[PDB]
Structure 1
Amino acid sequence: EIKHYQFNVVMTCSGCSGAVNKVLTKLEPDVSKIDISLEKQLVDVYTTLPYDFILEKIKKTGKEVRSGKQ
């Protein structure tokens, strides 16, 4: 069953937000929906996959993850 996670990630330019998009996009179709706002610095993910698995994938980009939740 599809779960919903939201991370608060420090993204400064459109390259930062693109980099996060990129790694989530590789997880399609297990990620069914991606929604990112540079300006509010938020990342929303709809997937079947574990929080912990998505937390790591996103930090791998080297962008600071301030906070998470489900």
Structure 2
Amino acid sequence: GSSGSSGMASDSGNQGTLCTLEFAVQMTCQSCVDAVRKSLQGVAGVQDVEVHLEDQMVLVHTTLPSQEVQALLEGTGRQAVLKGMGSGQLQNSGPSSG
């Protein structure tokens, strides 16, 4: 008799990409704005974070998913709602009618 078989699969998987995450955080006074920013201020992973008190918005430029940042944002005590998990701009060429 004789036999021979195998079932191995090389282990190779790279997952890493920096994207912009828009989170609508309900702010009231500076404090809230100071805490929201700090919560993600120079924090491992996070590369940038924008906080708009005018539109109670709060962006977060990190390689981590919204589900990951969401928790970090909620940790401050406020409610972080996802209003955009991506970006994209479309330009147009040609003369305009004026």
Query: Which TM-score band (shorter chain)?
Result: 0.7 to 0.9
Identity over aligned pairs, percent? 32
Higher Cα radius of gyration: 2
Is there any run of 5+ residues in structure 2 with no aligned partner, and where? 1-16, 86-98
| Equivalence for 2:64 | 49
Calculate the TM-score normalised by the size of structure 1: 0.86
Q: Which has the higher contact order (CA 8 A, sep 6+)?
A: 1
CA distance in 1, matches of 2:18, 2:58: 16
Task: State the Cα RMSD in Å.
Answer: 1.3
Aligned residues: 68
Is there any run of 5+ residues in structure 1 with no aligned partner, and where? none
Structure 1 stretches of 4+ with a deviation exceeding 6 A read none
Calculate the TM-score normalised by the size of structure 2: 0.63
User: Per residue, is there more strand in 1 or in 2?
Assistant: 1
